[PDB]
Design a binder for this molecule. Structure first.
Ligand code: CLA
Ligand code: CLA
Ligand code: CLA
Ligand code: CLA
Ligand code: CLA
Ligand code: CLA
Ligand code: CLA
Ligand code: CLA
Ligand code: CLA
Ligand SMILES: CC1=C(C/C=C(\C)CCC[C@H](C)CCC[C@@H](C)CCCC(C)C)C(=O)c2ccccc2C1=O
Lengths: 176, 154, 166, 42, 730
């Protein structure tokens, strides 16, 4: 007769969303951008074709020393000051709560009209395409599936096999 | 070295164990997998107990008669980490089981009606008092015996 | 009803002795790096004096010294229960008498004090750690290695090595 | 969404997602080192 | 309770201490209520004082069994499929020795995985799929992989009918509280329309696809996935397309036939699983009945009818409250369902119904003891729940002066007899054996009770066995052999790997086990009978229906005043039955191997797994560990380092778990209290205990952790003892 589940943090799920998905922008346009036959060709000789490898797992370290830094700073002062103890304001804390952060300390604040209001108008823009980005990337992340599964010849694994017409992979279109 | 015999560097009886016993693992002249891709005695199960050759590491490891290896651990000749190395380890791990036992417990008996909060779990595992254990340098080895759990509370 | 901390004397003094001996410990290394060539364990002995006698032994050396360290150390004990060390610059620091806005109890966070001319045991704060954790570092990387930094020919780039032990 | 001074609850036997698993990841150390009886160190 | 309603929350009850009797789980903390909650979780003296729902729950929380038996089976069909051995075993039976399960070689594991047949590593089976599965008028591994998901289909759906009850706003009274038709339906067309339906898919498809399997081939060199439609042309080999008959009746001519069936009895030479040419006819000849039968009726009438003098006036009116009970119409059922399971246990071993059983020894005795513990574990229950009636179910006493009010009238009486019955037995039913010892260890055989010393003479024969295998000469039509090959007269030639069934002779050492059974079956029942009868009132306690059918014990007075009750008569009644079945098992295999199971070769000189050692040597009750327990079991205590090994390696635990029960069975209670505090003390010093008042076991919970253990202990012990002396020689 209907679930018991608006996770109160029904309020927070929605912000790894704008994380996950704005983000899939980075893959969506640079991919098919690629640049078909640019003129053309992909060749990267430079730091890479003679100094004994370049990356892989010095890759990650440097690579996400920064993502390191930044992803942390991201949610852990999104906002929330007050930042300790001890009775309920719910999210699972707002034990920042009624105090934002400081009683007349510094400029904790951005912007006049005693709040943080990045003004009133802009529902426009990112309500639409952006929680789009959530939606969008559902189905061209449902293409990740289509785009490659079938492990282009070079391997049948656990041999059912189980019929046979013709191949599959990616580049755009479809026989049909 | 001590009461039993010497390690792996030589242990005749132990050798015979390697060989008959396991290798009769053999015992199945064939049993069909001439090329076939499943029945895996064949590869390892032996070789994983086996390529464990005249090497097992080398461990010292005393080995008595029948050559099954015995554990002295008296902190000498070679054998020290057959109790202490995996001993302090047992200690450290436990005690950070119950350091937090005496924790997602001493954090409740207060506020408003706290009479079985524990059949559900407030922070799962405690996931707050969690690391208090690795975040034990010294810790109970002082603060247990001085203050808090202080003889007073004794 | 003793809410929370506490402690104090305690192991703030606990630290600085780590800090300032991790600092010294690394004077240990300092040597073999500029006009370089000589160290690791090098299980010293340790700098060794004259050509008039020792001779592998002449004695447990090492063993003794720290019988001495020993009653000098009861001495710092011989301080911290009941404050006694003229300078007085560790137990809270010098600037004679003071800091002990934590000697009689009641801390919570208490930052501290102590140089007359002038500033503090502070940016001797963080040389304080740089070196403790450094050791952590230092006798971290032995257990496979023992030397730093040439140029851009073929050194600083990590070429091929060999697991942990396993 | 979870800050400082204890959090949200959990069921009767989440121990069955604690015996099974965690502990489960340990067979996962008992095949990486498919064997023990002393142990090398790091 | 709120939270708060009635009517005027959807907001569900997650949070606020308790529920279940009203100075409930109280604010104040405790542990006992955590075995409470699970125990008596299903019950009905609480939930509501008003029938209504309960039947609306049990028709749902039921459901989730079928669905489950349905998630189960699937992982068995799947399992009996891609974790193959079935494909390999079927082209190659008599030869293989089946598997479905296999480990994964983590830690010690692998020893458990030891070459089983069509060329692979695994752990064996004593659960006769691979043999229902003979059926497959089709064969194929991925196919069972459809029958498999076909299983998960029935489930999710036959599990959303359980949403589509209680949680959905439910039916009510009339629906079940008009019973008028129920069996009408059930038996008619399912009992009927299955057996019937099963007929149609038991000659259509199966018969033919093992009519020409009992020879050779390799499957798909036979039985396509559709092949068996309109094509009534291969049905040509296994009788006419009726030729000139039209819908049975008689203006029919047979100058040479009589449809499929052509009744058998005996055993296929090449697959002695009893003939299938019959198996259609018998299921057909069932259904009809059910098809005709489930057509009674609408109910009192028939029972409101035949009374007499001493008979049952209340026979007439034998329960309005049999539309208003459950605990009653469950207890009745369990006696039947239960007692109608272990009747399987025989007609199976003395008349196999699947291809390749008997030759398969271990893959149909496992059976005959699994089916055997249910036709027992469901019977003591079938008493428990009557005690649950006898105590409470109805509202008041509206039930009066009848068959029962009658039986109770005598009660220090029906059980007055039955008692002496048992000590007459026991003396004639066990010390009988003890004679032998005391006098064969004294040693003078002249005077034992041997199949040969006390007067009986080289024959048993003349009774009824010998007028069963010989009866195809009565009103009997016939059909070579009998009905069950194990009967006195004629025939031998049964099977070409090992053996199957043959006469099975008797006299003494068959005479007196058969009697220990009596005394065992009887004193079991004494304790349940007197237990459920004296359910509510007595002359040790009359104020004795005042809580429930459990209650620990009334109190130190009256002398004892402890066991009484009827939870506990259904606690010491299990304690026996564990024997009742546990010694019936002990019977069958020592027979079935001492004789029967054994083996042919030239001149078919029979060579039983044991040249009849039984003979003069079960009669001694030491011979029962000379010849049994110490003889066989040498395979359990040799079993290390092997493939089955998990049995010997259980056989120590569970031969431990039992020897842990006694601790729970044999002990006080304020004891582990008195102890639990010493503990609780040391606890408080470090500051580590009080919250949720730790407490000892609930007098009768303690008994609950006896018994249950004493059984899962004392039982699996043999579950191991067995599978370890039929796998490998036998
Ligand atoms: C958090 C835990 C906790 C702690 C610190 C202790 C500590 C102690 N127990 Mg103990 N105990 C516990 C839980 C605990 N127990 C539980 C749950 C039981 C089951 C009823 C017992 C049953 C028990 C008995 C019978 C005895 C002790 C005794 C003792 C003392 C001797 C230590 C010993 O050898 O037993 C080893 C510890 C056990 C056998 C306990 C097993 C349970 C552990 C694994 C709890 C683990 C944490 C648990 C999952 C909590 C959830 C975490 C939460 C923060 C989310 C010591 C003071 C002995 C004593 O009185 O002498 C001083 C006595 O023999 N205990
Ligand atoms: C997704 C759905 C769902 C939800 C949210 C609920 C919620 C509820 N149901 Mg419910 N129910 C459901 C599906 C659901 N049901 C289904 C599918 C069925 C039929 C199969 C039922 C049959 C049912 C009945 C008869 C009753 C309820 C009741 C209730 C209420 C009490 C629930 C409770 O705490 O039981 C806790 C129990 C569980 C969460 C598990 C359910 C047990 C089954 C279905 C699966 C477990 C068996 C499993 C194999 C365990 C044994 C093996 C083990 C070794 C692992 C609550 C509002 C009760 C009520 O109205 O209040 C008195 C009432 O008794 N339900
Ligand atoms: C068709 C029947 C069936 C049904 C539907 C019921 C239904 C019921 N019985 Mg019941 N019963 C049955 C057959 C049945 N019984 C049989 C055959 C017996 C004889 C053994 C009994 C003996 C019996 C008793 C003595 C009682 C009931 C009670 C009840 C009621 C309580 C149910 C409950 O809370 O779960 C109880 C189940 C548990 C608490 C789960 C514990 C199960 C443990 C013991 C595990 C079993 C061992 C197993 C090997 C362990 C799993 C593997 C492990 C090693 C990993 C309920 C109405 C009780 C009542 O008070 O009536 C209102 C009363 O206690 N029954
Ligand atoms: C705690 C006590 C102490 C101990 C250690 C034992 C131990 C034992 N007693 Mg014992 N006993 C005791 C006190 C004790 N008793 C007392 C005080 C009495 C009363 C006087 C008895 C009366 C008694 C009797 C009458 C019997 C025993 C027996 C036994 C033995 C069973 C064989 C065995 O376990 O092989 C050891 C090997 C294993 C346990 C291998 C286990 C591997 C399997 C189970 C899998 C691994 C475990 C896994 C968790 C299980 C799967 C469960 C899963 C679903 C979670 C065992 C050695 C029995 C016996 O065998 O001969 C006398 C006999 O029945 N005892
Ligand atoms: C450099 C950093 C590293 C670190 C420290 C973090 C840290 C974080 N990431 Mg993150 N992330 C990383 C690499 C990292 N990420 C990478 C390489 C990717 C993929 C390219 C992501 C993709 C990602 C997504 C989609 C999200 C996060 C989110 C988060 C936040 C919650 C993470 C979480 O799962 O809770 C840990 C809790 C557990 C129970 C485990 C947290 C600040 C989420 C967030 O921002 O929430 C507001 C969500 O948006 N991350
Ligand atoms: C005045 C002198 C000088 C000073 C500044 C100190 C200072 C100190 N001594 Mg000490 N000591 C001294 C002379 C001195 N000592 C001499 C001459 C002896 C010869 C026995 C000692 C023997 C001694 C011992 C055994 C110890 C100290 C300890 C200490 C330290 C703890 C304070 C204490 O124990 O007082 C004592 C406080 C009292 C109230 C004394 C009680 C008086 C009787 C009547 C009761 C402290 C830094 C302790 C220490 O640091 O241990 C690691 C302890 O070890 N001293
Ligand atoms: C074959 C077994 C079986 C089946 C079909 C059921 C079925 C049921 N049990 Mg149940 N139970 C069982 C074994 C079983 N139990 C055992 C072994 C125990 C241990 C004592 C219990 C202890 C128990 C309790 C305490 C409760 C139930 C309840 C229920 C009912 C609640 C269904 C629901 O709320 O949502 C269904 C929910 C899901 C399908 C969610 C998924 C959950 C996992 C487990 C899958 C349902 C009738 C509840 C009740 O009173 O209803 C009668 C009650 O809460 N059971
Ligand atoms: C009646 C049975 C029930 C039982 C006791 C088992 C038991 C088992 N299944 Mg299983 N299974 C079942 C129902 C069951 N299954 C059903 C209904 C399905 C269909 C969804 C499956 C589909 C399945 C697969 C695909 C696998 C198993 C596997 C296994 C084994 C792996 C152990 C495990 O599950 O956790 C760990 C184990 C013997 C695994 C196996 O056989 O490999 C050794 C394999 O992973 N099962
Ligand atoms: C209830 C049962 C079950 C089911 C679903 C079917 C179904 C079918 N049978 Mg059938 N059959 C059954 C039991 C069943 N049979 C049994 C037990 C026997 C032996 C006594 C037969 C002997 C039989 C014969 C000889 C034939 C069929 C044929 C058929 C097919 C069409 C004619 C028909 O019987 O019904 C539908 C009714 C009409 C078309 C009128 C149909 C697929 C025929 C066929 O192959 O297709 C035409 C025909 O060959 N059956
Ligand atoms: C031994 C014995 C006890 C003592 C038995 C006890 C106390 C068993 C209860 C022990 C429980 C099951 C331990 C539960 C603790 C854990 C579930 C908590 C930690 C959670 C896990 C992660 C370990 C009785 O209470 C008793 C009562 C009546 C008749 C006979 C006996 C009897 O024989």
């Amino acid at each position: 007769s209907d679930p018991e589940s608006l996770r109160w943090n029904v309020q927070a799920e929605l912000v790894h969303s704008r994380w996950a998905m704005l983000g899939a922008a980075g893959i969506f346009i640079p991919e098919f951008l690629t640049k078909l036959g640019i003129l053309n060709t992909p060749s990267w000789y430079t730091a890479g074709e003679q100094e004994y490898f370049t990356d892989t797992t010095t890759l990650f370290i440097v690579e996400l020393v920064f993502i390191g830094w930044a992803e942390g700073r991201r949610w852990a002062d999104i906002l929330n000051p007050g930042c300790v103890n001890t009775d309920p304001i719910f999210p699972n804390n707002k034990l920042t709560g009624t105090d934002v952060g400081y009683p007349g300390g510094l400029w904790f604040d951005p912007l006049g009209w005693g709040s943080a209001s990045p003004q009133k108008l802009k529902e426009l823009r990112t309500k639409e395409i952006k929680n789009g980005r959530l939606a969008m990337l559902a189905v061209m992340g449902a293409w990740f599936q289509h785009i490659y599964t079938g492990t282009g010849p070079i391997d049948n694994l656990f041999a059912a096999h189980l019929a046979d017409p013709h191949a599959t992979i990616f580049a755009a279109f479809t026989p049909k | 070295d001590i009461a039993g015999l010497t390690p792996c560097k030589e242990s005749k009886q132990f050798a015979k164990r390697e060989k008959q016993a396991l290798k009769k693992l053999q015992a199945s002249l064939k049993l069909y997998a001439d090329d076939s891709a499943p029945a895996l005695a064949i590869k390892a199960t032996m070789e994983k107990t086996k390529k464990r050759f005249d090497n097992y590491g080398k461990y010292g490891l005393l080995c008595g008669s029948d050559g099954l290896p015995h554990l002295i651990v008296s902190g000498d000749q070679r054998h020290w980490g057959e109790f202490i190395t995996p001993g302090i380890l047992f200690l450290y791990i436990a005690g950070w089981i119950g350091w937090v036992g005496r924790s997602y417990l001493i954090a409740i008996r207060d506020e408003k009606k706290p009479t079985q909060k524990e059949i559900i779990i407030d922070v799962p595992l405690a996931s707050s008092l969690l690391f208090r254990g690795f975040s034990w340098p010294v810790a109970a080895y002082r603060e247990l015996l001085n203050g808090e759990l202080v003889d007073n509370n004794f | 009803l003793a809410e929370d901390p506490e402690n104090l004397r305690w192991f703030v003094q606990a630290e600085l002795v780590n800090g300032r001996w991790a600092m010294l410990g690394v004077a240990g290394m300092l040597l073999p790096e500029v006009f370089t060539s000589i160290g690791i364990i090098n299980v010293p002995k340790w700098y060794a004096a004259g050509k008039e006698e020792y001779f592998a032994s002449s004695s447990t050396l090492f063993v003794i010294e720290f019988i001495l360290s020993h009653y000098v150390e009861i001495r710092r004990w011989q301080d911290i229960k009941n404050p006694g060390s003229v300078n007085q610059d560790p137990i809270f620091k010098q600037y004679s008498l003071p800091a002990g806005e934590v000697g009689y109890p009641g801390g919570i966070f208490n930052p501290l004090n102590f140089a007359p001319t002038l500033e503090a045991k502070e940016k001797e704060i963080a040389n304080g750690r740089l070196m403790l954790a450094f050791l952590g570092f230092i006798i971290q990387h032995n257990v496979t290695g023992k030397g730093p930094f040439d140029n851009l020919l073929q050194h600083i780039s990590d070429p091929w090595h060999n697991t942990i032990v396993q | 969404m979870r800050d400082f001074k204890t959090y949200l609850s959990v069921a009767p036997v989440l121990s069955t997602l604690w015996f099974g698993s965690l502990a489960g990841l340990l067979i996962e150390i008992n095949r990486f080192f498919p064997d023990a009886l002393t142990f090398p160190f790091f | 309770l709120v939270d708060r309603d009635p009517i005027k929350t959807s907001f569900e009850q997650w949070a606020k201490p308790g529920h279940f009797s009203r100075t409930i789980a109280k604010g104040p903390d405790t542990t006992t209520w955590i075995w409470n909650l699970h125990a008596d979780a299903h019950d009905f003296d609480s939930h509501t004082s008003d029938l209504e729902e309960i039947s609306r729950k049990v028709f749902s929380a039921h459901f989730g069994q079928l669905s489950i038996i349905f998630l189960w089976l699937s992982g068995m069909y799947f399992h009996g499929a891609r974790f193959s051995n079935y494909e390999a075993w079927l082209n190659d039976p008599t030869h293989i020795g089946p598997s479905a399960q296999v480990v994964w070689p983590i830690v010690g594991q692998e020893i458990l995985n030891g070459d089983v047949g069509g060329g692979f590593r695994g752990i064996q089976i004593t659960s006769g799929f691979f043999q229902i599965w003979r059926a497959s008028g089709i064969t194929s591994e991925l196919q069972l992989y459809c029958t498999a998901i076909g299983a998960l289909v029935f489930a999710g759906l036959m599990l959303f009918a359980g949403w589509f009850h209680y949680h959905k706003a439910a039916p009510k009274l009339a629906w079940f509280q008009d019973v008028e038709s129920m069996l009408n339906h059930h038996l008619a067309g399912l009992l009927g329309l299955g057996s019937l339906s099963w007929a149609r898919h038991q000659v259509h498809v199966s018969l033919p696809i093992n009519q020409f399997l009992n020879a050779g081939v390799d499957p798909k060199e036979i039985p396509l996935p559709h092949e068996f439609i309109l094509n009534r042309d291969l049905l040509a080999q296994l009788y006419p397309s009726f030729a000139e008959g039209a819908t049975p009746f008689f203006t029919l001519n047979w100058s040479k036939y009589a449809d499929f069936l052509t009744f058998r009895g005996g055993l296929d030479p090449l697959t002695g699983g009893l003939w299938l040419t019959d198996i259609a006819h018998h299921h057909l000849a069932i259904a009809i009945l059910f098809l005709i039968a489930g057509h009674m009726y609408r109910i009192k009438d028939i029972l409101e009818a035949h009374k007499g003098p001493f008979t049952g006036q209340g026979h007439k009116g034998l329960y309005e409250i049999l539309t208003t009970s459950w605990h009653a119409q469950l207890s009745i059922n369990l006696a039947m369902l239960g007692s109608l399971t272990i009747v399987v246990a025989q007609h199976m071993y003395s008349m196999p119904p699947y291809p390749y059983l008997a030759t398969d020894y271990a893959t149909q005795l496992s059976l005959f003891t699994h089916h055997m513990w249910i036709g027992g574990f469901l019977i003591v229950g079938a008493a428990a729940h009557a005690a649950i009636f006898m105590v409470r179910d109805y509202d008041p006493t509206t039930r009066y002066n009848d068959l029962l009010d009658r039986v109770l009238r005598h009660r220090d009486a029906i059980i007055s007899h039955l008692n002496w019955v048992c000590i007459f037995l026991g003396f004639h039913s066990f010390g009988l054996y003890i004679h032998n010892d005391t006098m064969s260890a004294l040693g003078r055989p002249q005077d034992m009770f041997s199949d040969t010393a006390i007067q009986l003479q080289p024959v048993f024969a003349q009774w009824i066995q010998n007028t069963h295998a010989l009866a195809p000469g009565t009103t009997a039509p016939g059909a070579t052999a009998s009905t069950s090959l194990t009967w006195g007269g004629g025939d031998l030639v049964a099977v070409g790997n090992k053996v199957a069934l043959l006469p099975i002779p008797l006299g003494t050492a068959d005479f007196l086990v058969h009697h220990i059974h009596a005394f065992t079956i009887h004193v079991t029942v004494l304790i349940l009978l007197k237990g459920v009868l004296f359910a509510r009132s007595s002359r040790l306690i009359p104020d004795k229906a005042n809580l429930g059918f459990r209650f620990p014990c009334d109190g130190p007075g009256r002398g004892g005043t402890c066991q009484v009750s009827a939870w506990d008569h259904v606690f010491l009644g299990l304690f026996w039955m564990y024997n009742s079945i546990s010694v019936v098992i002990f019977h069958f295999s020592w027979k079935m191997q001492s004789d029967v199971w054994g083996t042919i070769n030239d001149q078919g000189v029979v060579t039983h797994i044991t040249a009849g050692n039984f003979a003069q040597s079960s009669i001694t009750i030491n011979g029962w560990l000379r010849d049994f327990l110490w003889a066989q079991a040498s395979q359990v205590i040799q079993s290390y380092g092997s493939s089955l090994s998990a049995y010997g390696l259980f056989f120590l635990g569970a031969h431990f778990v039992w020897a842990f029960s006694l601790m729970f069975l044999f002990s006080g209670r304020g004891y582990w209290q008195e102890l639990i505090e010493s503990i609780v003390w040391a606890h408080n010093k470090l500051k580590v205990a009080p919250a949720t008042q730790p407490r000892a076991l609930s007098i009768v919970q303690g008994r609950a952790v006896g018994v249950t253990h004493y059984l899962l202990g004392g039982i699996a012990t043999t579950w191991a003892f067995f599978l370890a002396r039929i796998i490998a020689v036998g």
